From Swiss-Prot, chain A:
Protein source organism: Saccharomyces cerevisiae (strain ATCC 204508 / S288c)
Transmembrane portions of the chain: none
Name under which the protein is recorded: Fatty acid synthase subunit beta
Function: Fatty acid synthetase catalyzes the formation of long-chain fatty acids from acetyl-CoA, malonyl-CoA and NADPH. The beta subunit contains domains for: [acyl-carrier-protein] acetyltransferase and malonyltransferase, S-acyl fatty acid synthase thioesterase, enoyl-[acyl-carrier-protein] reductase, and 3-hydroxypalmitoyl-[acyl-carrier-protein] dehydratase.
UniProt record similarity statement: Belongs to the fungal fatty acid synthetase subunit beta family.
Miscellaneous remark of the record: Present with 91800 molecules/cell in log phase SD medium.
Subunit structure: [Alpha(6)beta(6)] hexamers of two multifunctional subunits (alpha and beta).
Curated annotation (Swiss-Prot), chain C:
Functional summary from the UniProt entry: Fatty acid synthetase catalyzes the formation of long-chain fatty acids from acetyl-CoA, malonyl-CoA and NADPH. The alpha subunit contains domains for: acyl carrier protein, 3-oxoacyl-[acyl-carrier-protein] reductase, and 3-oxoacyl-[acyl-carrier-protein] synthase. This subunit coordinates the binding of the six beta subunits to the enzyme complex.
Residues represented out of the complete protein: 872 to 920 of 1887
Residue pairs linked by disulfide bridges in the UniProt entry: none
Note: Present with 17000 molecules/cell in log phase SD medium.
Family, similarity comment: Belongs to the thiolase-like superfamily. Fungal fatty acid synthetase subunit alpha family.
Post-translational modification summary for this protein: 4'-phosphopantetheine is transferred from CoA to a specific serine of the Acyl carrier domain by the C-terminal PPT domain. This modification is essential for activity because fatty acids are bound in thioester linkage to the sulfhydryl of the prosthetic group.
Protein name: Fatty acid synthase subunit alpha
Description of how the protein assembles with itself and partners: [Alpha(6)beta(6)] hexamers of two multifunctional subunits (alpha and beta).
Top-rank taxon: Eukaryota
């Protein structure tokens, strides 16, 4: 809850079709930076190809949304 | 409300005051309970 | 704001004050919903 803005108990308790995080107030913004620092590094021939895991989350994003047709 | 001065304030104005203040408070209060009852701490509603 | 007592609108304006059409106030209000002033609200 306090670092990614979701409840793993909820997800487990009632399988949600979708789930949006909201980067609300001062705490909302704290959360989204933790999303923004998700890095996927890729050492390719000496070179370190790093990318944001969450492409879209940026300084102007108001929310992100996880999706799944099943749950 | 028009043509109602101090000594004319009555049924209409009291009702009007209810729509234009007390129930607005009640309305903000209501959405507060909903959000809160759902742990919605990062999605404020802006009230103009 | 003038819309569907505007007869004195031109006169009040004759003093360097602005009166507004409804499309104008609406634009003004809508401007408070822009991301920029929205976050401002969230701070205080």
């Amino acid at each position: 809850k306090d670092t990614y803005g979701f409840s793993i108990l909820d997800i487990v308790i009632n399988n949600p079709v979708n789930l949006t995080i909201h980067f609300g107030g001062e705490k909302g913004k704290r959360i989204r930076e933790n999303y923004s620092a998700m890095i996927f590094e890729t050492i390719v021939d000496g070179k370190l190809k790093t990318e944001k895991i969450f492409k879209e989350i940026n300084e102007h994003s108001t929310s992100y949304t996880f999706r799944s047709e099943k749950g | 409300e028009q043509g109602i001065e101090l000594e004319h304030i009555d049924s209409k104005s009291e009702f009007a005051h209810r729509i234009m203040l007390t129930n607005i408070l009640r309305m903000m209060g209501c959405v507060k309970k909903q959000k809160s009852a759902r742990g919605i701490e990062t999605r404020p509603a802006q009230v103009i | 704001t003038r819309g569907t007592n505007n007869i004195i609108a031109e006169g009040i304006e004759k003093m360097g004050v602005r009166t507004f059409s409804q499309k104008e106030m609406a634009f003004n209000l809508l401007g408070l919903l822009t991301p920029e002033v929205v976050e401002l609200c969230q701070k205080s």
